[PDB]
Coordinates of all heavy atoms in Angstrom, one line a residue:
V1 N -11.2 -9.2 -1.8 CA -10.2 -10.2 -1.7 C -8.9 -9.7 -1.2 O -8.5 -8.6 -1.4 CB -9.9 -10.8 -3.2 CG1 -8.8 -11.9 -3.1 CG2 -11.1 -11.2 -3.9
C2 N -8.5 -10.4 0.0 CA -7.2 -10.2 0.6 C -6.1 -11.1 0.3 O -6.3 -12.2 0.5 CB -7.5 -10.1 2.2 SG -6.3 -9.0 3.1
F3 N -5.0 -10.6 -0.4 CA -3.9 -11.5 -0.8 C -2.8 -11.5 0.2 O -2.5 -10.5 0.7 CB -3.4 -11.1 -2.1 CG -4.3 -11.5 -3.3 CD1 -4.2 -10.9 -4.5 CD2 -5.0 -12.8 -3.1 CE1 -4.9 -11.4 -5.6 CE2 -5.7 -13.3 -4.2 CZ -5.8 -12.4 -5.3
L4 N -2.3 -12.6 0.5 CA -1.2 -12.8 1.4 C -0.2 -13.9 0.9 O -0.6 -15.1 0.8 CB -1.8 -13.2 2.9 CG -2.9 -12.5 3.4 CD1 -4.2 -13.3 3.2 CD2 -2.6 -12.2 4.9
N5 N 1.0 -13.6 0.5 CA 1.8 -14.5 -0.2 C 3.3 -14.4 0.3 O 3.6 -13.4 0.9 CB 1.7 -14.2 -1.8 CG 2.0 -12.8 -2.2 OD1 3.2 -12.5 -2.5 ND2 1.0 -11.7 -2.2
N6 N 4.0 -15.3 -0.2 CA 5.5 -15.4 0.0 C 5.7 -15.3 1.5 O 6.5 -14.3 2.0 CB 6.3 -14.4 -0.8 CG 6.2 -14.7 -2.3 OD1 6.7 -15.8 -2.7 ND2 5.7 -13.9 -3.1
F7 N 5.2 -16.2 2.4 CA 5.6 -16.1 3.8 C 6.0 -17.5 4.2 O 6.0 -18.4 3.5 CB 4.4 -15.6 4.6 CG 3.1 -16.4 4.4 CD1 2.8 -17.3 5.3 CD2 2.3 -15.9 3.4 CE1 1.6 -17.8 5.1 CE2 1.0 -16.6 3.1 CZ 0.7 -17.6 4.0
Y8 N 6.4 -17.6 5.5 CA 6.9 -18.8 6.2 C 6.9 -18.5 7.8 O 7.2 -17.5 8.1 CB 8.4 -19.2 5.7 CG 8.8 -20.5 6.1 CD1 8.5 -21.5 5.2 CD2 9.5 -20.8 7.2 CE1 8.9 -22.8 5.5 CE2 9.9 -22.1 7.6 CZ 9.5 -23.1 6.7 OH 10.0 -24.3 6.9
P9 N 6.4 -19.5 8.4 CA 6.1 -20.8 8.1 C 4.5 -20.9 7.6 O 3.9 -19.8 7.3 CB 6.2 -21.6 9.5 CG 5.9 -20.6 10.5 CD 6.4 -19.3 9.9
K10 N 3.8 -22.1 7.6 CA 2.5 -22.2 7.1 C 1.5 -21.6 8.1 O 0.6 -20.9 7.6 CB 2.1 -23.6 7.0 CG 0.8 -23.8 6.4 CD 0.3 -25.2 6.7 CE -1.3 -25.4 6.5 NZ -1.8 -26.6 7.1
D11 N 1.8 -21.7 9.4 CA 0.7 -21.1 10.4 C 0.6 -19.5 10.2 O 1.5 -18.7 10.2 CB 1.5 -21.4 11.8 CG 0.7 -20.6 12.8 OD1 -0.5 -20.8 13.2 OD2 1.5 -19.8 13.6
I12 N -0.8 -19.3 10.0 CA -1.2 -17.9 9.7 C -2.7 -17.8 10.1 O -3.5 -18.6 9.7 CB -0.7 -17.4 8.3 CG1 -1.2 -16.1 8.1 CG2 -1.5 -18.2 7.3 CD1 -0.5 -15.3 6.9
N13 N -3.0 -16.6 10.6 CA -4.5 -16.4 10.8 C -4.8 -15.0 10.3 O -4.3 -14.0 10.7 CB -4.9 -16.5 12.3 CG -6.0 -15.7 12.7 OD1 -5.9 -14.6 13.3 ND2 -7.2 -16.2 12.3
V14 N -5.8 -15.0 9.4 CA -6.4 -13.8 8.8 C -7.7 -13.4 9.3 O -8.6 -14.4 9.6 CB -6.5 -13.9 7.3 CG1 -6.6 -12.6 6.6 CG2 -5.1 -14.6 6.7
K15 N -7.8 -12.1 9.6 CA -9.1 -11.6 10.2 C -9.6 -10.5 9.3 O -9.0 -9.8 8.6 CB -8.9 -10.9 11.6 CG -8.4 -12.0 12.6 CD -8.1 -11.3 13.9 CE -7.5 -12.2 15.0 NZ -7.1 -11.7 16.2
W16 N -11.0 -10.5 9.1 CA -11.8 -9.5 8.5 C -12.5 -8.5 9.3 O -13.1 -8.9 10.3 CB -12.8 -10.3 7.6 CG -12.1 -10.8 6.3 CD1 -11.9 -12.2 6.1 CD2 -11.8 -10.2 5.0 NE1 -11.4 -12.4 4.9 CE2 -11.3 -11.2 4.3 CE3 -11.9 -9.0 4.6 CZ2 -10.9 -10.9 3.0 CZ3 -11.5 -8.7 3.3 CH2 -11.0 -9.6 2.5
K17 N -12.5 -7.2 8.9 CA -13.1 -6.3 9.7 C -14.0 -5.4 8.9 O -13.7 -4.6 8.1 CB -12.0 -5.2 10.4 CG -10.9 -6.0 11.1 CD -10.0 -5.0 11.8 CE -10.7 -3.9 12.5 NZ -11.6 -4.4 13.7
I18 N -15.4 -5.7 8.9 CA -16.5 -4.9 8.3 C -16.7 -3.7 9.2 O -17.4 -3.8 10.2 CB -17.6 -5.7 8.0 CG1 -17.3 -7.1 7.5 CG2 -18.6 -4.9 7.2 CD1 -18.5 -7.9 7.0
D19 N -16.1 -2.6 9.0 CA -16.3 -1.3 9.8 C -15.8 -1.6 11.1 O -16.6 -1.0 12.0 CB -17.6 -0.7 9.6 CG -17.9 0.3 8.6 OD1 -17.0 0.2 7.5 OD2 -18.8 1.2 8.5
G20 N -14.8 -2.3 11.5 CA -14.4 -2.8 12.7 C -15.1 -4.0 13.4 O -14.5 -4.6 14.2
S21 N -16.3 -4.4 12.8 CA -17.0 -5.6 13.3 C -16.3 -6.9 12.6 O -16.1 -6.9 11.4 CB -18.5 -5.6 12.9 OG -18.7 -5.4 11.6
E22 N -16.2 -7.9 13.5 CA -15.6 -9.2 13.1 C -16.8 -10.2 12.5 O -17.4 -10.7 13.4 CB -14.9 -9.7 14.3 CG -14.1 -11.2 14.0 CD -13.6 -11.0 12.5 OE1 -14.1 -11.5 11.6 OE2 -12.2 -10.6 12.4
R23 N -16.9 -10.2 11.4 CA -17.8 -11.2 10.7 C -17.1 -12.0 9.8 O -16.4 -11.7 8.8 CB -19.0 -10.4 9.7 CG -19.9 -11.4 9.0 CD -20.8 -10.7 8.1 NE -21.2 -11.5 7.1 CZ -20.5 -11.7 6.0 NH1 -19.4 -10.9 5.7 NH2 -21.0 -12.4 5.0
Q24 N -16.8 -13.3 10.3 CA -16.1 -14.3 9.6 C -17.0 -15.3 8.7 O -16.5 -16.2 8.1 CB -15.3 -15.3 10.6 CG -14.1 -14.7 11.1 CD -13.1 -15.6 11.8 OE1 -13.3 -16.7 11.7 NE2 -12.2 -15.0 12.6
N25 N -18.3 -15.0 8.7 CA -19.2 -15.8 7.9 C -19.0 -15.4 6.4 O -19.0 -14.4 6.0 CB -20.6 -15.6 8.3 CG -20.9 -15.7 9.9 OD1 -20.9 -16.9 10.4 ND2 -21.0 -14.6 10.4
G26 N -19.1 -16.5 5.6 CA -18.8 -16.4 4.1 C -17.6 -16.0 3.7 O -17.3 -15.0 3.0
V27 N -16.4 -16.7 4.3 CA -15.1 -16.4 3.9 C -14.5 -17.6 3.1 O -14.9 -18.8 3.4 CB -14.3 -16.1 5.2 CG1 -13.8 -17.4 5.8 CG2 -13.0 -15.2 4.9
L28 N -13.6 -17.3 2.2 CA -13.0 -18.1 1.3 C -11.5 -18.2 1.5 O -10.8 -17.2 1.1 CB -13.4 -17.9 -0.3 CG -14.7 -17.6 -0.5 CD1 -14.9 -17.2 -2.0 CD2 -15.6 -18.7 -0.1
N29 N -10.9 -19.2 2.1 CA -9.5 -19.2 2.3 C -8.7 -20.4 1.6 O -9.2 -21.5 1.8 CB -9.2 -19.3 3.8 CG -9.9 -18.2 4.7 OD1 -10.1 -17.2 4.1 ND2 -10.2 -18.5 5.9
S30 N -7.8 -20.1 0.8 CA -7.1 -21.0 -0.1 C -5.7 -20.9 0.1 O -5.1 -19.8 0.2 CB -7.5 -20.9 -1.5 OG -7.4 -22.1 -2.3
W31 N -4.8 -22.0 0.2 CA -3.5 -22.1 0.3 C -2.7 -22.6 -0.8 O -3.3 -23.4 -1.6 CB -3.0 -22.9 1.7 CG -3.3 -22.0 3.0 CD1 -2.4 -21.5 3.8 CD2 -4.7 -21.9 3.6 NE1 -3.0 -20.9 4.9 CE2 -4.4 -21.1 4.8 CE3 -5.8 -22.4 3.3 CZ2 -5.4 -20.9 5.7 CZ3 -7.0 -22.0 4.2 CH2 -6.6 -21.3 5.2

């Protein structure tokens, strides 16, 4: 779980790095 809070504006993109590899499958993003 990666927490990202108390920011502005709404626009934001989060990236996951499994040992440097970009696997975005099976991600849970809530605002």
Side-chain angles (χ1 to χ4, degrees):
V1 186
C2 202
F3 277 156
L4 310 103
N5 58 91
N6 293 298
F7 54 94
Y8 196 85
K10 180 201 170 189
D11 170 59
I12 181 162
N13 158 251
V14 188
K15 298 175 178 177
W16 284 98
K17 307 185 46 65
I18 311 184
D19 269 24
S21 65
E22 188 37 270
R23 183 189 148 267
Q24 286 192 18
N25 311 285
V27 80
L28 313 180
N29 307 333
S30 208
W31 284 259

